[model samples]
Target: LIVTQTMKGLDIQKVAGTWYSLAMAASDISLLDAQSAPLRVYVEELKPTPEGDLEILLQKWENDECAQKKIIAEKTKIPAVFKIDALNENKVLVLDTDYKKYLLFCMENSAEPEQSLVCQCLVRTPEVDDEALEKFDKALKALPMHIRLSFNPTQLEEQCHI
Candidate 1:
């Protein structure tokens, strides 16, 4: 991908609402934990900082678990800032408005809400697709079951019902 700073200077319109993370470039359905996770993020609010840049709210499922939906970025998790860093059919840039940084981009027509465009990027990071296996390369392994179970839809109490 081409690295362009145009994203810093582009006219940014706050892409409202939260988004759910789907399958990335790597792991598929199971990693998303749809059975447990809420599958949606409420993008709290958006505001511009003193630097003339934008800030956005971000949150994530705990330990990649669905049941543990939680806030991840409170400071200024901004994306869709500046202009098109690189454009083909869509735009792309760095999405570091959270605990981790990622190269994020989007594509859309001049429509009411750019949900489709945002969703395209939210599906997962490029690394989430390619280097995803690398996450397991470490000794820790995927998050523990408890960490994930917390995000479980039943709220961790209905286990007996099953």
Candidate 2:
């Protein structure tokens, strides 16, 4: 799969806000499957640590109830790259972001039985812009193996459970 660019000077402050999933794609189809897709969570907040790592708060559904998950992504030498221990130490990259309207995040794990790659397009609001989707498609074009899926926050049965 073709990897994309990692943002060079991403400011955590700008990214630390409410973001809704606009679309997502994954090498493992199950990750984007109907039953478990909503489990990926809506990004609620991102807190920067003194050590330069990030603490993430995500809203999702579990056991037929809305739940919150807190995770810490450790910083690497690369400014826009991080390692999340829970995601099997997957390498996460901030691929693209306007720091205003939309952001693109990607995670890849070659250690898995099959190479795993997941990309997400997140936005500041629920109403999507053509520009956001255009960016998402351009990024996904590099990884043709992934099946792309568009999502509406209001339409997701699980995210709406809350």
Candidate 3:
């Protein structure tokens, strides 16, 4: 359900700003729970390119350190979908976003014999936002159909040096 006909009008410019991962869900929660993982990325910014592509700046929380990862998501025929490095095999979709506050998105990655999905709730604030969670739940109910889903409840922190 997250992947739709289109996001209507995905204004990447409006969404370009600092973001924090307030919630994360994946087919395998183990990936999000890893002591050092790329899946546990703190979304720093979403830069828009003239070519309509997206430049994602992420801080990968690896153990006790933060590693930088700059990903260029090449825009596909669908404005809401793009091909990113995390899972080059499939498309990353911009399920939803409200420009000023939250972004709910999903991407496909390594599977457990099924199509493994990774969904994240990114927000401008670090504190818990109930409205964002509500949106997340709505999307959750409609997504992943028959796939096993796991939720990782944790706030991505800025505990590392710049």
Top TM-score model: 2
Candidate 1 at 99: error in angstroms? Answer: 26
Q: Report how far off residue 159 is in candidate 1 (Å).
A: 22
Candidate with top lDDT is 2
For model 1, where is the 10-residue window of minimal lDDT? 143-152
- CA deviation > 4 Å runs, candidate 2: 37-39, 112-114, 156-162
RMSD of each: 15.5, 2.9, 4.2
Q: What is the TM-score of each candidate against the true structure?
A: 0.26, 0.83, 0.79
What digit string (tens of lDDT, one per residue) describes model 1 on residues 1-162?
222222343334333333323222212223334433332232223344545454544444445443322222222234343332222232334332221322233222233221212311231222243232222222113212111111222321232112
Model 3 stretches astray by more than 4 angstroms = 1-6, 110-115, 145-157, 160-162
Clash count for candidate 2 is 0
Error of 2 at 30 (Å): 1.2
List model 3 lDDT by residue over 1-162, tens digit each. Answer: 335434669886687888777776765555555646435556778888887888998777665766787888887887788887553466678878988899988776533422456677788876687888888767876555333222233434444212
**For model 1, what is the error of residue 64's alpha carbon versus the real structure, in angstroms, after optimal superposition?**
11
lDDT of 3: 0.68
Question: Residue 138, candidate 2: how far off, in angstroms?
Answer: 0.1
